[PDB]
Amino acid sequence: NPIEVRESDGYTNEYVSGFVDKWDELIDWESRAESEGDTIINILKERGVKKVLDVATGTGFNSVRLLQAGFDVVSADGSAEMLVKAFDNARDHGYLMRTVQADWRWMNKDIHDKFDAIVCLGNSFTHLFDEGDRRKALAEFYALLKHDGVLLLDQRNYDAILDDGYSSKHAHYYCGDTVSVYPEHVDEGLARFKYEFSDGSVYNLNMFPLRKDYTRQLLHEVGFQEINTLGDFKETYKEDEPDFFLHVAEKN
Ligand SMILES: Nc1ncnc2c1ncn2[C@@H]1O[C@H](CSCC[C@H](N)C(=O)O)[C@@H](O)[C@H]1O
């Protein structure tokens, strides 16, 4: 059956769509690419990666960055509305995106290749609140990797927030002062972040506060052999603790 673009289906809603639109309206990709550096691209190049699957395309930032770097990218997302934005953003940068609508829990339904690398970036994995769904998603990613493939999966540093550290009592800024991100409510099973933009817009979003070692455990448990977790400093006013972690999980 064909996929229809809807502002409200099972994979996105108008609120989250408004949030990503607001981020993209105020934060240009050039600035974001400079602030994030070439860590992702360099990891892939040092591994000889050619074919990449983006499982969390969103409005397309990671996919377009990888296309610009010369990778063969397939751009998947659960949301058809997101994929339309991502395709047109790629078009605006002079690239033809290969979009596929797919749910992490059945990734090979319409994707039949295997990939040198998968990227699941922008703190996307934390959207899953059910442990069974987490294992299912990581198992689906594992199965889509070639024998010597690698999964790049990032997350916010929830350990520092759950342990009542400095980062739990303070907002974190991105793209200068364009947006602040504040952990309004934190418990073992839920973090609600307040995102306040420079134009006065406020969005409140829920995430599952994955501890760094719990994510590593899940990756090991679905079959990944070696995992290296890197501190990833993205925020404007850097602290002793990174605001993100990047897991580099090798299939074999
Ligand atoms: N279960 C699921 N299956 C497929 N896609 C999912 C999903 N849960 C969340 N997503 C997607 O994950 C994306 C997170 S947004 C992050 C987008 C991009 N990596 C960036 O950093 O800008 C959303 O577009 C959302 O639709």
Author numbering: 12 to 263
From the paper:
To further test whether the functional switching of MpGSMT from the inactivated into active state requires a helix-to-loop transition of the H1 helix of the N-terminal region, we examined whether reducing the stability of the H1 helix could enhance MpGSMT activity by lowering the threshold of the conformational change. Four residues in the H1 helix (His21, Glu23, Glu24, Lys28) show a high propensity for helix formation and are not directly located in the active site. These residues were mutated to amino acids with considerably lower helical propensity (Gly, Thr, Asn and Ser, respectively) to give a tetramutated MpGSMT (MpGSMT4mut). It should be noted that none of the four mutation sites are conserved and all four were replaced by residues found in other members of the GSMT family or conserved in the GNMT family. Indeed, MpGSMT4mut was abundantly expressed and purified to homogeneity, and the crystal structure of MpGSMT4mut was essentially identical to the wild-type enzyme, except that the N-terminus of H1 helix prior to residue Glu25 underwent a helix-to-loop transition. Consistent with our assumption, the introduction of helix-destabilizing mutations increased the activity by 2.36-fold compared to wild-type MpGSMT, suggesting that the presence of the H1 helix may be indicative of the catalytically inactivated enzyme and that enzyme activation can be triggered by a conformational change involving the disruption of this helix.
